[PDB]
């Protein structure tokens, strides 16, 4: 009675058939007493584990050695090897039974390695040459000291003791192959063997000549060592930091490939389908809008406007009137949307540019801006009665793809600049206290190439230095490589995000241009202006807004709703499923059903 | 049961005062693996120069361990392999063409010069330090020449020819009931795990990168067989592990281990291929994120021993071992390096800083939650020691 | 051409052996409990009481003796995989120590005899026998094959040598796979 | 010494004019340790005393490479374990060593009449096993080989194929990777472990929709201005059901050894731990796998070797439903009556006191 | 295909023998309709034993085999159950049912003696079909347990109580009509 | 070619007034068939026994035979265990009821001969799980009754 329903529930949950086929095969393997019981429970937990009630009912209803895949067991005939010094304990404690190996733990073919980009390869080569020279130097010295002491001890005797003196194998030292290796390196290995047995036989005639040969070779090798130490140090300083960022060489190609339109809508589509496919599970509450941005610091906007103004004054793609229209559109939009007074914008630009030493709709229909700048039953009644929002604080904007991608670019730039402006305090305090020891200053051991061109973060502040350097890059006053290197050494390889601070600005300018060159988006922004300038509204007015803006683009295009909260300076972006709630889902039956029966008043369908 | 945290700097404890011993054989650096071969004992010479130019010799005793003899290496190995080691040299290699294949020392771990000599030095260091720990005239025993945890019983594999970790640990086991081996190398120490896989007097704890990565061994489900079940902890991680992640994983798992297993002696293998900018490992640790583990294990205050390990770029490993010996004498070393013979190694700033990369840490808190929950589930059964 | 009809379960056993001795790196645990001499003796002894005529008994004993002699002269030559020859060779050496010659009929289990039978068609087709003897030998061999197919319940169990013990197969150490394969 | 080293030049020479043009821009305290280093011998184990042809380049027996003991007559070459008998490598008999073929040819003096004669005599001698007579004469005319199953046992099963060196391959071998020789030639720092870029791994290729994890029902693409929210989707190799690495607790992308098998498959070996063994046969294709749909439904045993329909047994969902409920119901009642009888036994035993 | 056997108690075989003796020598023919049909017999069977079986599979198999016996018995009644004598009764009842606007269902008239007849014949029927080993083994197990229950409740309908009464004993003597047209008059 | 007719009705293996098929050699009584046909209401045209009808039905094609048997055991999938029997009677020939020799080997007082004489000397699962649970409930109640009876015996 309840179990037919169980098999129907299982077929529903699994959703597919091949996986249901395997589910039934598990069940039958259990049925013919092949599978254990709790092995069946564990095998089904991979199927009905995302459900709690179904699997707990299954638990209450069904009434519920080399376990490591790396080792083998050898017979007790491979554990029989001499092992002389193995006492009674090293038999009881150690293990001779089980065996492992990286040739059959890798399945006879494997062992990938990391990538280790080219600059680390050159650094490794430099370190290897260093090690080689150091090894030969130290070995030559280590044999020279012993040969010197035996020479100094052997000459103080008479001719008789010299004639009968001989050295035992090892020269009385603790190592036996050092001097052999050194002499075979320097002395023509055949001649090296004959001279080494001559040294073992009669040192009184062979030790001085080998000693002086080793001395001259040592001084030659040391001269070569310093003359190569110069180049080693210079190349190591050239390519050290370039090798310490595993993302910085692939950010100028990841911020141009993962910052297109497809990906930009794809992340929000993905969080949407996640919300639905996981909302099928009923016990979870209904999730609200897709994306969340938060804007606690308002001063970066003037910096973004400064970057945009710098680009537009530099670029040659647009003509001067177009440049002014772009500047004024950006200024007024970011003053209106984020509710920043234009007078405060002008005071901020006053504070900014003095240290370097009509409405928005008037711009929407560009002719207006040209003229301006050349002049210089009871149900619906009682539903609309209660709930009137006075002193509007939460605003909304209904947008096609262009406004959304533009606001996306804006948020990307703001988030990157806020990252580095949150690091600024500590990184500046650190770079102010660089304790450079003069012992490296005098020996030319420090590279002042970054300090000579002024790109070094001297005790001036760091964030303003980033802004100024990025502006110099945008103008074309500084190459990309040196800006990158300044940002590597200055902060760390921790601030790699700002290598594309000019391309993202160019993209934001292109989108601010599309935001008024198109006709549909111009009218959508005009409706946005008309709603934003309003100070009080009702749900019916919001439905009029949504339907009017949807009337502009076709029934195949997407639509996004940007909900701006002025009390806490928040932005919430919602993907609009064409027949989803134009406002956010509440929790009250009252609000929901009265909102829909007031939408019923308009002749548009439900 | 994992939870991310910040990383406060390393602070020395005043009460935990130890008499350290530092073992160095003046010849360890004169045995060259070869032209380009990724292992050099040279890094021990540099580490030594850094350790002694800080004036750290006034804080600890410096010894020279007598190299091991053929009848003490065999406390782990088989006698035919030991005799091959003693006889083989780059000239007679064509003479043992049927033995170079059986023991796997012809090309993978080649014969260069003084192979038996370097192995004897390392084994002697390890065993002598373990013995000085026993008789009670020390608390720590530093040795950067040992730590060859890849060498098997009758074959070398992974540039490890004498598995001196095991000889030293056996020398420790001759008096001590329980030994805990903490392995923070980026690779898996399959030698010291397979060698003590079925025993309950030795507990290994190995924090290694798992993937298609050498030695391809060390899953989460390898908790020993027989009487050594739940007495082998493997923590397999992913790339890019950083200081805060590694600390938030290492601190709780090790506190639980030392809370239930309660070892009487520790062997910490602080290899240095788990650092950033290395040659074969893929982690992204910093010099302080690697010495935090040593400081935490020292915080417990039981007989301890620091061993060497991997380390394929010499400068980071030299500076790391210098800083670890520094905080092992209960001082936080100054970050400005003094003048040493190998000064020109430590470009470009000439300070005691190892700098992490911006590598992407791919260890999500859900994966580490799963892993540490599995590991605590296993560890539930190692209480009655 | 000549053709032999192996039961499908014996083909599955031969392919399982191909798995175990090839890339699973296992060898046969020698000397196995049930060898070729004992198997052929039990078969010839239990089938002997079937037919009364002397021709049947004579042909049975002749086939069994000839098959044991071909097993002796063939196992070392062509019935061992590459991975497991060293084992054989080691036994060969351990024979020369005690001055007792190696004849595999008493040491090697049934699976190598199964391999012999499996390859017997080509061995037959390469010589210059007549047409009658080929077919009579093939018929005797197929009777043996159905005998074995009925008796697979005792000879070819699967026991996972890594798990408990005493399986038909054993694991190889790294030294063995180094010297046997990579010589 | 004039011998070039790894540095590129002899050791007694500074950088050449070329190199120092593209790698440019335009007391100590280790005098000691011969006063502080002191010998330590407190160890416990101190008492321990301590036609000009050329031979082939592949083994004539197993067709591989290694060390070859060749013949002078023929271009054949053999390993040391693949000889008759296998020869120990050190004590190798010097001189003119011939293989079995060449020795047999030189023994008959390359005349076939004597061959007929000796073969006839061998037939006459071995009269006891005459059927196997001629066979036991040719065993000494072929150089040894290694055993390969004939093609009519490899071709009875279709999912079993000879590997590169004649090894077992059972469709669970992933593939050889030639485009990973191209990964050796890699197209930049876009790793084959699939890190730092996962928009195209959370997206179905052919369809265009999203690869969803079976356990969490989310394709956590995150947002690639905050890449710390991806979750490393990987698709299984049999059922193509994609999982997160945090859901199937594995932490790697299986790339080399085998095909990854989802946790949604029923086993191909059990170890019931009575212990007992396998329940699934091989796939005996070439169209000799007969299917038999039984007339019995609720009691058939038949194996673990079934096939589901709306010697391979055929069975439908209703039969599995009924067998499963049968199992658990009779098991429930069996254990119930068992505990009932045992407790009443305990009661009648205790009241007896 | 196999050689399968059905262990039937000798008491029911003796009932078969005395039935043949009553229909061949004195040619006493069974009464149509019987006191209780075969539908009632099999219904009493499955209703008495379905409330003594635990698992769903056992009860499914019980009901399936009972319905199968119904279908076969009412199907094979005309081919292999009756002797030469009652074929006349069969044809006259068939023509009566034909003029009664509906075809006959042979489970509505006959009784347990013909069911025992068919059950005793059943082993050869199974043996001539390609039913596999487990299926036919289940068949004969079901049938064996059924006929064991039949032996257990033989008393109600098999032994003719008050044999002098023609209405109680289902065997009635034939008139000269059947005595003639049986042996060819 | 006209074959010969056997004067014995294979249903009773005795002679009399009978009719035969056009393709089958044996004849049968008018009342030996099912339905037993009147001797005067003869079938129109050529009449065959079950065997020849089956032959012209299968067209001597084994594939059709297997197809019909499989789809028949699928039609009778409610009564599956009997299906293989139910399909065969649709093609067999009727014969008199004679219990095989295996039955009468027990009593020697009976004699028989060639004369054929004897001489004296879905809701399904719901209903089934319902039956299951009700029987199990009854039986566990009777088991606790067993225990109470035992305890009552201990009340002696
Ligand atoms: K252990
Ligand atoms: K490790
Ligand atoms: Zn390592
Ligand atoms: Zn070979
Ligand atoms: Zn030759
Ligand atoms: Zn997941
Ligand atoms: Zn899968
Ligand atoms: Zn008749
Ligand atoms: Zn006919």
Residue numbers in the entry:
A (entry chain A): 663 to 726, 749 to 1041, 1063 to 1081, 1118 to 1347
B (entry chain B): 2 to 386
C (entry chain C): 219 to 401
D (entry chain E): 105 to 130, 166 to 189, 255 to 478, 489 to 524, 538 to 580
E (entry chain D): 217 to 401
F (entry chain F): 255 to 375, 543 to 577
From the paper:
The Rpd3S complex plays a pivotal role in facilitating local histone deacetylation in the transcribed regions to suppress intragenic transcription initiation. Here, we present the cryo–electron microscopy structures of the budding yeast Rpd3S complex in both its apo and three nucleosome-bound states at atomic resolutions, revealing the exquisite architecture of Rpd3S to well accommodate a mononucleosome without linker DNA. The Rpd3S core reveals a compact architecture composed of three modules: a Sin3 Lobe (Sin3 and Rpd3) and two modules involved in the nucleosome binding (named “NB1” and “NB2,” respectively).
We purified the endogenous Rpd3S complex from S. cerevisiae with all five known subunits by employing a C-terminal Flag-tag on Rco1. The Sin3_HID/HCR and Rco1′_NTD wrap around the HDAC Rpd3. The Sin3_PAH3 catches an α helix of Rco1′_CTD. Two copies each of the Rco1_EID interacts with the Eaf3_MRG, forming the NB1 and NB2, respectively. The central positioning of Rco1′_PHD2 within the complex serves to bridge the Sin3 Lobe and NB1/2, making a contribution to the stabilization of the Rpd3S core.
